[PDB]
């Protein structure tokens, strides 16, 4: 009843007993597996008890003193008001646990080192902006990146919602032409349309940093320019391919996801941006080489004089590896924290064993943990994984339009 | 009906074929287990009934004279004998469907082009051998490979199974060592021990072709050596790295899986080896670079004068891409059929479009379809997929020892 999980490199066997706790049912049934699809009143008290019980067991405080105590005040809080506020340490503990429970994150070896900014006493887009701006500057830290989450006020009935309209805090523009096709980042084309709609002058460049669209509850959004000296970017150069710099490619330093919904103990924070540091394949393989992204792969291969006339020359494979080398080299020369997919996967194997000892398993999404280049050269490829839903969690949510 | 998106293009289809999935898989709504490698007359009647229905749809004679005659016939044969016999046309269709239905085969654009050898009159292990040599000969075809399957007698009450103990018709010995290491292919240490135990005189090379261990019903397995001139091989060299030839590396031309059970209309064929042609990543990435297989990756990287002390130089990625280049160039030099992962995955995308129009979907195992290097450079990475079990089917079965 406890899934047997094998590692095929070594032959070791473990049993995922942690799977027994899954709440939000996944997309799969005995009839068919759907694991590769991207996006597959007093219920508030059940999840509240469960979260509080977690907290105290994690501080060796189950069934003692403040445990009994803290259960009542939230019971009383919901009774009177129909919701509750999290003790500061609980918000801290739930944010770290959500990151710990993110099956698609390969960087969770870091889950215990998280800096939580409490922005629950917020109102207005101007208030959001300086909170975001403090996050960005703290997390960037002149390139010595530091994990951070800013938690904006939770959700209540009657009132609108705090939402960041960008999927990340730093994204590049996407402009069309006299021919439908796109200049800049095609992923963001749509929010670039909303920004220009709300009175922003589009640039020319392929690497203009989009302005933020910040939304106070029940009020339409407000365009903000970010302070440019606050957006740390890295010009991309290759260590031995002198022409690579001339391609004018750049990527920003901070990956800061600003569209997911943090859920702790039963409360839903639709605005709660978290940031870490990049794994190089995210930039060098997905952002730059995806056919529906910057799609640069063939331009680099021409420059390398590779034979693009037959796929069996593996020119795609060759150009992709170099693009990744240029990302790692550029970030390291610019002294910005970055991790290669080999270092990151091996740390995740370390994470998995830690979690086997601590919690009896770890939810992991195999399709997202395995890197998008060189899959079977990393140890996660040969590791079987179990995927399920634990709380607290980061959840997807509809676009606020 | 599961909605399936292609993320490179934007397409959206619904998998209605999944609604007919018979046997159950390993996942539940609680937990996905997709990444795991190895997850009564009346029921025989209902399987057979469904297959016969299938066969008559494919000949555009559904609900006809011959259709009900065969249904009636099969029930009379199950009642009289507890089993029934496939006609030859039904056997050919059922083996082609088993390939069509195989979720972990990326080669299924070719499913209709399959050579079916009916060995169901096979009498002994010695005749079994003769049938297998002819299969290898036909399929190899001097390097112009042809897809084939030989079907040996079905499992039946009163008599044991025919079995090929070898997992493939062509496999290289793996010998344990003085210092606990393995010479040759470590995947094959167990079967090698069995051959020696069964009277084989081992060699001591790294690429020694294993003899066949062939089990006639209620017989111990019998040893048969493959005539050297039946096993086409390919010395491996690199188009520019001339020291590569000095590694002494080879691979065989024919991939012939011999340990799977073919299932048609409820009947079971525990011995029915099938074979196609390689995709270069199986040899280059998995067979040669897996740490638990030949594991040449670091040795290749040293020779390339890559810096193997830091993972961020991407030495592993660079040495693996050249190993694949060498595999492709070597098989093309020798005029032995081979497909690279870019051509293979593009033809699999055409298979999914053919299959959507034909059946309303296609069972696909994302983690097996996506190649082990350069995944997001192939279009199957960006394709969501539905995994499920259709009959007729190839199934895994326990090792006969
Ligand atoms: C500090 C170093 C970190 C690294 C190297 C890292 C790495 C990654 C990578 C490569 C992905 C794949 C996402 C994609 O391909 O779209 C991912 C996903 C994710 N990570 Fe991490 N991450 C880090 C920090 C964090 C932090 C601090 C949080 C939250 C507190 C977090 C939460 C998540 C979530 C929720 C996802 C799922 C994203 C999605 O579904 O789009 N990560 N991570
Ligand atoms: C004609 C060219 C073919 C190509 C290029 C091809 C390709 C592949 C590849 C790359 C795999 C994954 C195996 C692995 O990663 O270890 C696979 C699996 C498989 N293929 Fe195909 N194949 C071909 C022909 C065939 C034929 C003729 C059959 C059956 C009649 C077949 C049935 C299967 C099955 C059952 C599996 C799953 C094997 C397993 O789970 O171990 N294939 N194929
Ligand atoms: C914290 C963190 C660290 C890291 N290394 N990567 C990520 C990411 C991502 C990709 N992001 C793109 C925008 C989005 F689709 F909205 C969410 C997914 C996040
Ligand atoms: C017909 C065919 C074509 C192709 N290109 N690859 C294969 C394969 C395989 C994988 N093989 C690994 C060893 C085994 F477990 F014994 C059987 C499965 C088969
Ligand atoms: C459909 C498929 O699951 C999809 O392309 C996934 C595969 N794995 C991924 N893995 C990561 N880390 N990020 C992604 O966007 C994807 N895309
Ligand atoms: C544990 C993991 O599922 C295992 O390594 C799988 C992954 N995908 C694979 N895919 C193919 N095509 N062949 C394999 O042998 C494997 N191995
Ligand atoms: Cl990104
Ligand atoms: Cl093989
Ligand atoms: Gd030039
Ligand atoms: Gd040379
Ligand atoms: Gd050597
Ligand atoms: Zn599943």
PDB file of C-alpha atoms and ligand atoms in Angstrom, chain B residues 95 98-99 102 104-108 110 113-114 147-149 257 260 274-279 281-282 286 339 344 368 394 396, ligand 2:
ATOM      1  CA  UNK B  95       0.690  -8.243 -33.513  1.00  0.00           C
ATOM      2  CA  UNK B  98       0.245  -4.692 -30.046  1.00  0.00           C
ATOM      3  CA  UNK B  99       2.930  -2.454 -31.515  1.00  0.00           C
ATOM      4  CA  UNK B 102       2.808   0.151 -26.937  1.00  0.00           C
ATOM      5  CA  UNK B 104       6.829   3.442 -24.556  1.00  0.00           C
ATOM      6  CA  UNK B 105       7.710   2.955 -28.261  1.00  0.00           C
ATOM      7  CA  UNK B 106       8.655   6.151 -30.111  1.00  0.00           C
ATOM      8  CA  UNK B 107       8.971   4.147 -33.341  1.00  0.00           C
ATOM      9  CA  UNK B 108       5.275   3.592 -33.857  1.00  0.00           C
ATOM     10  CA  UNK B 110       6.049   2.255 -38.613  1.00  0.00           C
ATOM     11  CA  UNK B 113       4.907  -2.183 -41.662  1.00  0.00           C
ATOM     12  CA  UNK B 114       5.611  -5.360 -39.677  1.00  0.00           C
ATOM     13  CA  UNK B 147      10.762  -4.847 -38.571  1.00  0.00           C
ATOM     14  CA  UNK B 148       9.670  -8.379 -37.705  1.00  0.00           C
ATOM     15  CA  UNK B 149       8.202 -10.588 -34.998  1.00  0.00           C
ATOM     16  CA  UNK B 257      13.445  -7.846 -27.526  1.00  0.00           C
ATOM     17  CA  UNK B 260       7.981  -9.774 -23.415  1.00  0.00           C
ATOM     18  CA  UNK B 274      10.211  -8.619 -32.013  1.00  0.00           C
ATOM     19  CA  UNK B 275      12.809  -6.329 -33.512  1.00  0.00           C
ATOM     20  CA  UNK B 276      13.132  -2.985 -35.283  1.00  0.00           C
ATOM     21  CA  UNK B 277      16.157  -0.699 -35.683  1.00  0.00           C
ATOM     22  CA  UNK B 278      17.906   1.435 -33.063  1.00  0.00           C
ATOM     23  CA  UNK B 279      17.445   5.037 -32.256  1.00  0.00           C
ATOM     24  CA  UNK B 281      20.365   7.568 -28.148  1.00  0.00           C
ATOM     25  CA  UNK B 282      19.729   4.021 -26.862  1.00  0.00           C
ATOM     26  CA  UNK B 286      21.958   4.856 -22.322  1.00  0.00           C
ATOM     27  CA  UNK B 339      17.412   6.971 -36.620  1.00  0.00           C
ATOM     28  CA  UNK B 344      12.451   9.771 -34.527  1.00  0.00           C
ATOM     29  CA  UNK B 368       9.972   7.069 -22.248  1.00  0.00           C
ATOM     30  CA  UNK B 394       3.129  -6.406 -25.167  1.00  0.00           C
ATOM     31  CA  UNK B 396       6.313  -7.614 -19.070  1.00  0.00           C
TER      32      UNK B 396
HETATM   33  C1  LIG C   2      11.172   0.241 -36.440  1.00  0.00           C
HETATM   34  C2  LIG C   2      11.901   1.009 -35.612  1.00  0.00           C
HETATM   35  C3  LIG C   2      11.669   1.111 -34.071  1.00  0.00           C
HETATM   36  C4  LIG C   2      12.161   2.105 -33.325  1.00  0.00           C
HETATM   37  C5  LIG C   2      12.977   3.297 -33.890  1.00  0.00           C
HETATM   38  C6  LIG C   2      11.788   1.883 -31.943  1.00  0.00           C
HETATM   39  C7  LIG C   2      12.087   2.695 -30.864  1.00  0.00           C
HETATM   40  C8  LIG C   2      11.896   2.407 -29.522  1.00  0.00           C
HETATM   41  C9  LIG C   2      12.583   2.998 -28.380  1.00  0.00           C
HETATM   42  C10 LIG C   2      13.685   4.080 -28.459  1.00  0.00           C
HETATM   43  C11 LIG C   2      12.100   2.441 -27.265  1.00  0.00           C
HETATM   44  C12 LIG C   2      12.530   2.730 -25.816  1.00  0.00           C
HETATM   45  C13 LIG C   2      13.363   1.560 -25.305  1.00  0.00           C
HETATM   46  C14 LIG C   2      14.312   1.986 -24.212  1.00  0.00           C
HETATM   47  O1  LIG C   2      14.456   3.205 -23.996  1.00  0.00           O
HETATM   48  O2  LIG C   2      14.946   1.121 -23.551  1.00  0.00           O
HETATM   49  C15 LIG C   2      11.097   1.465 -27.646  1.00  0.00           C
HETATM   50  C16 LIG C   2      10.357   0.673 -26.794  1.00  0.00           C
HETATM   51  C17 LIG C   2       9.471  -0.322 -27.206  1.00  0.00           C
HETATM   52  N1  LIG C   2       9.172  -0.662 -28.513  1.00  0.00           N
HETATM   53 FE1  LIG C   2       9.830   0.229 -30.268  1.00  0.00          FE
HETATM   54  N2  LIG C   2      11.052   0.710 -31.900  1.00  0.00           N
HETATM   55  C18 LIG C   2      10.970   0.194 -33.182  1.00  0.00           C
HETATM   56  C19 LIG C   2      10.321  -0.990 -33.520  1.00  0.00           C
HETATM   57  C20 LIG C   2       9.482  -1.719 -32.705  1.00  0.00           C
HETATM   58  C21 LIG C   2       8.752  -2.930 -33.046  1.00  0.00           C
HETATM   59  C22 LIG C   2       8.868  -3.607 -34.430  1.00  0.00           C
HETATM   60  C23 LIG C   2       8.037  -3.308 -31.955  1.00  0.00           C
HETATM   61  C24 LIG C   2       7.088  -4.504 -31.751  1.00  0.00           C
HETATM   62  C25 LIG C   2       6.624  -5.233 -32.773  1.00  0.00           C
HETATM   63  C26 LIG C   2       8.276  -2.329 -30.900  1.00  0.00           C
HETATM   64  C27 LIG C   2       7.731  -2.326 -29.619  1.00  0.00           C
HETATM   65  C28 LIG C   2       8.253  -1.697 -28.498  1.00  0.00           C
HETATM   66  C29 LIG C   2       7.968  -1.993 -27.116  1.00  0.00           C
HETATM   67  C30 LIG C   2       6.985  -3.073 -26.629  1.00  0.00           C
HETATM   68  C31 LIG C   2       8.681  -1.168 -26.348  1.00  0.00           C
HETATM   69  C32 LIG C   2       8.717  -1.124 -24.805  1.00  0.00           C
HETATM   70  C33 LIG C   2       9.923  -1.970 -24.413  1.00  0.00           C
HETATM   71  C34 LIG C   2      10.150  -1.894 -22.931  1.00  0.00           C
HETATM   72  O3  LIG C   2       9.244  -1.384 -22.225  1.00  0.00           O
HETATM   73  O4  LIG C   2      11.228  -2.339 -22.453  1.00  0.00           O
HETATM   74  N3  LIG C   2       9.157  -1.391 -31.404  1.00  0.00           N
HETATM   75  N4  LIG C   2      10.994   1.479 -29.023  1.00  0.00           N
END
